[PDB]
Amino acid sequence: ELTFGGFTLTREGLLSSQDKEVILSPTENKILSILLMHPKQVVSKESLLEKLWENDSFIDQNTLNVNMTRLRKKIVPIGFDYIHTVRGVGYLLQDPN
Amino acid sequence: QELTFGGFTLTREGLLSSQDKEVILSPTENKILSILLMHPKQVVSKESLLEKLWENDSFIDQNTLNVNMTRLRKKIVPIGFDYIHTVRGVGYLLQNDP
Numbered sequence A: 001e002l003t004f005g006g007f008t009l010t011r012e013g014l015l016s017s018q019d020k021e022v023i024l025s026p027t028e029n030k031i032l033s034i035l036l037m038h039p040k041q042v043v044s045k046e047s048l049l050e051k052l053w054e055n056d057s058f059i060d061q062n063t064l065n066v067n068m069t070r071l072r073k074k075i076v077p078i079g080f081d082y083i084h085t086v087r088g089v090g091y092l093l094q095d096p097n
Numbered sequence B: 001q002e003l004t005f006g007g008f009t010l011t012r013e014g015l016l017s018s019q020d021k022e023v024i025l026s027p028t029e030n031k032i033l034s035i036l037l038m039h040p041k042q043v044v045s046k047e048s049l050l051e052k053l054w055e056n057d058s059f060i061d062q063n064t065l066n067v068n069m070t071r072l073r074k075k076i077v078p079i080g081f082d083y084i085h086t087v088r089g090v091g092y093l094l095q096n097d098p
Helices: A026-036 A045-054 A061-078 B027-037 B046-054 B062-079
Strands: A002-004 A007-009 A014-017 A020-023 A042-044 A083-086 A090-093 B003-005 B008-010 B015-017 B022-024 B043-045 B084-087 B091-094
Touching: A002 A026, A007 A026, A014 A061, A020 A061, A026 A045, A026 A061, A026 A090, A042 A045, A045 A061, A045 A090, A061 A083, B003 B027, B008 B027, B015 B062, B022 B062, B027 B046, B027 B062, B027 B091, B043 B046, B046 B062, B046 B091, B062 B084
Parallel strands: none
Antiparallel strands: A002 A007, A007 A014, A014 A020, A042 A090, A083 A090, B003 B008, B008 B015, B015 B022, B043 B091, B084 B091
């Protein structure tokens, strides 16, 4: 499993912490997985798309945009507010502490 | 992907796809179907399915299993995966497959 800040992501797409859970689609799962594998690193949109293709998610950039938005809307409510937008660059997974 | 049966493939992330159609399974639905896919053409009792779920990080009870099994079948039967058979009082059976 992938872990970050007390959250665990399972291969089937369960993200959980404490008594909180959300279920991620395969695309949402693969996006979050890539970020969890690169904590505290700025991941450009191009790099994220490349890594998705590496993992058999052959989506385009608008699909990536939509799924990133859906992902964040899903996981912020259970306390995973660690994905930051870097305007014009990409994303950064980082825990303020 | 890798588990496959009856023209369908199940990815680890929960995508069940045929040549024509696909559906996304919840983690519990994924685990249930995976257990049946790993025991094809075998009768799997409810007790056995439950313990195997409990041996793979699930925490549901029998009544929540029934709801999940109904929800699973309502997701996958419409895309042509009608291979889960109920055996009254016994359990479930995954089975040219008919």
